Amino acid sequence: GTILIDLSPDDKEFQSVEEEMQSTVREHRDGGHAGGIFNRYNILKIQKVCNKKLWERYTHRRKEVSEENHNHANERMLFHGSPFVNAIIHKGFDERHAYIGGMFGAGIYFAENSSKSNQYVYGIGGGTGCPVHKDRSCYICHRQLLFCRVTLGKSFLQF
Template identity: 35%
Template sequence: MDYYHDRRVVQHAASQPWVRGFRLDEIDYKNETYQWIYDKMHNSISIHNGVKISKYHIVKIYQVKNSFLWSKYTARRSEIARDFPRGQLAPEIRLFHGTCHADVIVRNGFNVKYSNELSMFGKGIYFSDVSSKCNQYTFEAGGSGACKLHGNVHCTLCKRKMLVCKVTLGRNFRANMPMNGILRPPHGCHSVVAYPAQSFLKYPEYVIYNNYQAFPSYMIEYKISI
């Protein structure tokens, strides 16, 4: 799929109404956006370490309304757009971010200082279009963590949280090998993107290095079935 020209992405990308301050608005399950997120999650499930999720049981979906983060995001997006021909929009994409810190991020935004520069693509903020990839990071930072209550990586009883974020990729650098240790994208680029390749990467990864280059549009509370 050409994500930059996905009409559904464009439609929902324009759906963030202005609000002063911070608020989480629960989305009704009959709402078109709810169904769009439900489909986006279920259509991007893969096998991880021999285990495949059979279903996401969504508890609630919230639209995030945060005027401070939104203004910071749009300012960064405009800054990136200046590196493109006049009138051309900076490429954006809707991506998943799995984290045990979802509640903090929707209030205060992303913070790259908590990233590990020894990660595959350096000290950045990581996203994927594969929901089950991000699901692995919902119990513990760094992935492969178990729930605190049952000590189970594949726990079907504990609630998890995942974000759907609007990410301005801008001009991306296509990585074909690890880039451990970098603190910013290569010169002239705004992000690093890597696609699956034999003996390199199993699932796509999208990495930014600026706190305000992504906006957490939706927060999903859910459980899984295996």
């Protein structure tokens, strides 16, 4: 029931997401071991994801969380990278598949910095790298990231 609306690069919607991708890049202090060596991205495509079922599944939950948090949803736009984005955009995020051996438990992890999420496109620490070259620093293969509406509500600070 999902459909992908394509954004033209002259679209200001496109330009803000692109700017957000580029401007949040950071120099990770592992020399680029997990995500690759780079400063900038080549942004090929930005698609808006329309699925009414997942949309309402979301807003409805954001209302539940809002009543619990002094009428604040505490919403955020955050990046997410994992080898399962094509599942996620059709079926929706699913805690039953969560990263079980993460720092903060079996959760669904997001990031402020795009480059931070980029480190998880090909798995934990990148693992092997791209499907075709086994190069975690490949400039040939296309990667995919999600830019998500995430409801944080009252968030607990840990570690």
